[PDB]
């Protein structure tokens, strides 16, 4: 959904994150659950990373003539994890975790007609979480948590074929016969395909809490309600356009030129809040199944507006996403004291309504198809590894004067090691 990242755990990548939040064992998925802590005897530490290899493609042709084919844009993705849940007494316990539930790819050559809206896009996001939980009565446990999110981000864009058309158009209207437009055309042609049209980049922290509730029918059965707050990140970074300050103030699309000089610019990224009901059931000694349904009020992510020292708009862009559900169902098979198995189906609607899709964040309802294993070493430590396959229906896009077409597809590799004390 949009650009949030579930990943966070190999142990869970195996079950297409289906009910993460009611299936505590191996720790890790304590974060995103909080109220799971209460379910731990010995400090359990698990870590690892989930490798993401996405194949997203853009296809099309531009008024210009040049092709909009962008064969590959979403670079691989690292995204590590690391958790540490630790009991305190028999009513309390605390936990920590280093995850990254937000961020994206998107390359696009520094050339490419349509670069006007393709340049580059990066958002790395490390969410530091420290949670604690009470266990009220024998079957109810409540969790609360503070989160410290950090994020680096870069946004580059360049004048695509634009220069052409502009120039072109000029040259076919009673203005191509004008000593004026003529040179104007010239200048227009001068904007090299690869001229950095927009640059914004910045590092900044942001905070926000989170809570969760855990109810267990009995030891083998559970259900949960979780909530992660929004996280307004008030960036204070840099901006700059290599276009000549002339283009500015003509109320045209083209983002505020700075004559290739850096202006200090502010902007706010709203990482969305999210709710999630979940359930776990150990039907039979070896077999257990898990539900899951999540809400990510993406509605909060309305725009990427970037302002200046003097409070003017430097670079804006409508996003107007809308709420989205994500459903998941997976099961686990505990063969014997050493091995453990899992498999999952997961689906979720794209937060971005067609009216606003963008080659920048080509998003489309994603379908998950995963399964993995867990080789226990000795009642104390183990290793988690699972693969995931997400394929989605290629959808149409309409940005600027360009008509695109984008196809999504991607694989996942997970590996985790976890020890106990
Ligand atoms: C802290 C690690 C950050 C790794 C950056 C992760 C990039 C994942 C790529 C997501 C881009 C895909 N798409 C279609 C959703 O925009
Ligand atoms: C001053 C740096 C500002 C960049 C931080 C904003 C990153 C937004 C990344 C996700 C949305 C990207 N997009 C399509 C709106 O350009």
Torsion angle of C-alpha atoms 353, 359, 360, 364, degrees rounded to 10: 40
Residue having the nearest C-alpha atom to atom 13 of ligand 2: 360
In residues, how long is the chain?
Answer: 421
d(CA 350, CA 362): 10
Q: 197-211: string of b/e by CB count within 10 Å (b at 16+)?
A: bbbbbbebebebebb
Ligand 1 pocket check for 324: Cβ under 6 Å: no
d(CA 135, CA 94): 12
| DSSP code of residue 388 | E
Alpha carbon of 275 to ligand 1 centroid (Å): 21
Q: Are β-strands 221-228 and 293-295 bridged in parallel, bridged antiparallel, or unpaired?
A: unpaired
If one counts every other C-beta atom within 10 angstroms of the C-beta of residue 312, the result is 11
If one counts every other C-beta atom within 10 angstroms of the C-beta of residue 174, the result is 7
d(CA 416, CA 383): 5
Q: Which of 72, 54, 53 is nearest to 112 (CA)?
A: 72
CA 272 vs CA 101, 107, 111, 297: distances in Å: 10, 24, 32, 6
Region of residue 379 (phi > 0: left; psi between -120 and 50: alpha; otherwise: beta): left
Ligand 1 atom closest to the CA of 79, numbered from 1: 2
d(CA 89, CA 346): 36
Q: Which residues are CB-neighbours of 56 under 8 A, at least 6 positions away?
A: 72, 73, 74, 105, 362, 406, 407, 408, 409, 410
Ligand 2 pocket check for 201: Cβ under 6 Å: yes
d(CA 187, CA 182): 9
Ligand 2 pocket check for 121: Cβ under 6 Å: yes
CATH architecture type of domain 1-421: Beta Barrel (2.40)
Q: Are β-strands 140-159 and 120-134 bridged in parallel, bridged antiparallel, or unpaired?
A: antiparallel
Is 261 within 8 Å of 244 (Cβ atoms)?
no
| DSSP code of residue 10 | H
What φ, ψ does residue 162 adopt, rounded to 5°? -25, -65
**3-state SS assignment for residue 300:** helix
Q: Which residues are CB-neighbours of 89 under 8 A, at least 6 positions away?
A: none
**3-state SS assignment for residue 115:** helix
Q: Are β-strands 293-295 and 274-284 bridged in parallel, bridged antiparallel, or unpaired?
A: antiparallel
Q: Which residues are CB-neighbours of 275 under 8 A, at least 6 positions away?
A: 225, 226, 227, 294, 295, 297
Q: Which of 322, 392, 326, 323 is nearest to 355 (CA)?
A: 322
| DSSP code of residue 246 | G
Alpha carbon of 103 to ligand 1 centroid (Å): 5
- Its sign, for the CA torsion 36, 100, 303, 403, is negative
Region of residue 309 (phi > 0: left; psi between -120 and 50: alpha; otherwise: beta): alpha
**Cα distance from N-terminal residue to C-terminal residue, the chain:** 37
Chain-centroid distance of CA 117 in Å reads 19
If one counts every other C-beta atom within 10 angstroms of the C-beta of residue 215, the result is 15
d(CA 333, CA 287): 5
Alpha carbon of 122 to ligand 1 centroid (Å): 8
Residue having the nearest C-alpha atom to atom 2 of ligand 2: 201
- Its sign, for the CA torsion 156, 160, 165, 168, is positive
Q: Which of 155, 309, 317 to mutate to test the pocket of ligand 2 (most atoms within 8 A of CB)?
A: 155
> Can you list the pairs that 255-260 forms with residues at least 24 positions away whose Cβ atoms lie under 8 Å?
255/157, 255/197, 255/198, 255/314, 255/315, 255/316, 256/308, 256/312, 256/313, 256/314, 256/315, 260/196
d(CA 23, CA 16): 13
d(CA 312, CA 182): 32
Alpha carbon of 304 to ligand 2 centroid (Å): 6
The angstrom resolution of this structure is 3.6
Q: Which residues are CB-neighbours of 232 under 8 A, at least 6 positions away?
A: 206, 268, 269, 270
């Amino acid at each position: 959904a949009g650009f949030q990242l579930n990943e966070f755990s190999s142990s869970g990548l195996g079950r297409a994150y289906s009910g993460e939040g009611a299936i505590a064992d191996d720790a890790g998925n304590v974060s995103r659950g909080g109220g799971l802590i209460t379910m731990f005897d010995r400090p359990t530490f698990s870590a690892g990373a989930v490798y993401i290899d996405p194949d997203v493609n853009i296809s099309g042709t531009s008024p210009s003539g040049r092709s909009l084919k962008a064969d590959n844009i979403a670079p691989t993705a690292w995204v590590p994890n690391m958790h540490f849940v630790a009991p305190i007494n028999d009513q309390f316990g605390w936990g920590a975790s280093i995850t990254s539930n937000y961020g994206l790819a998107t390359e696009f050559n520094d050339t490419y007609a349509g670069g006007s809206v393709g340049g580059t896009t990066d958002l790395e996001t490390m969410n530091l979480n420290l949670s604690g939980a009470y266990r009220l009565n024998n079957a109810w446990s409540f969790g609360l948590g503070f989160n410290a999110v950090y994020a680096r981000a870069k946004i580059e864009r360049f004048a695509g074929d634009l220069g052409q058309l502009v120039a072109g158009q000029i040259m076919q209207s009673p203005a191509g016969q004008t000593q004026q437009g003529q040179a104007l055309a010239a200048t227009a042609n001068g904007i090299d395909s690869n001229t950095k049209t927009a640059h914004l980049n910045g590092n900044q922290w942001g905070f926000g809490w989170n809570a969760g509730i855990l109810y267990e029918l009995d030891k083998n059965n559970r259900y949960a309600l979780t909530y992660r707050s929004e996280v307004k990140i008030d960036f204070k970074g840099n901006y700059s356009s290599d276009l000549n300050r002339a283009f500015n103030n003509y109320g045209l699309p083209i983002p505020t030129a700075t004559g290739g000089a850096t202006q200090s610019g502010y902007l706010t990224l709203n990482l969305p809040e999210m709710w999630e009901v979940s359930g776990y059931n150990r039907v039979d000694p070896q077999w257990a199944i898990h539900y899951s349904l999540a809400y990510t009020s993406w509605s909060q992510f309305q725009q990427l507006k970037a302002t200046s020292t003097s409070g003017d708009t430097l670079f804006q862009k409508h996003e107007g996403f809308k709420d989205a559900y994500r459903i998941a169902l997976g099961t686990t098979y505990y063969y014997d004291d050493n091995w453990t198995f899992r498999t999952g189906i997961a689906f979720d609607d794209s937060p971005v309504p067609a009216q606003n899709r963008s080659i920048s964040i080509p998003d489309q309802d994603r379908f998950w198809l995963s399964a993995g294993t867990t080789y226990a070493f000795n009642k104390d430590a183990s290793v988690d590894v699972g693969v995931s396959y997400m394929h989605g229906q290629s959808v149409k896009i309409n940005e600027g004067p360009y008509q695109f077409e984008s196809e999504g597809k991607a694989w996942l590799f997970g590996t985790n090691f976890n020890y106990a004390f």
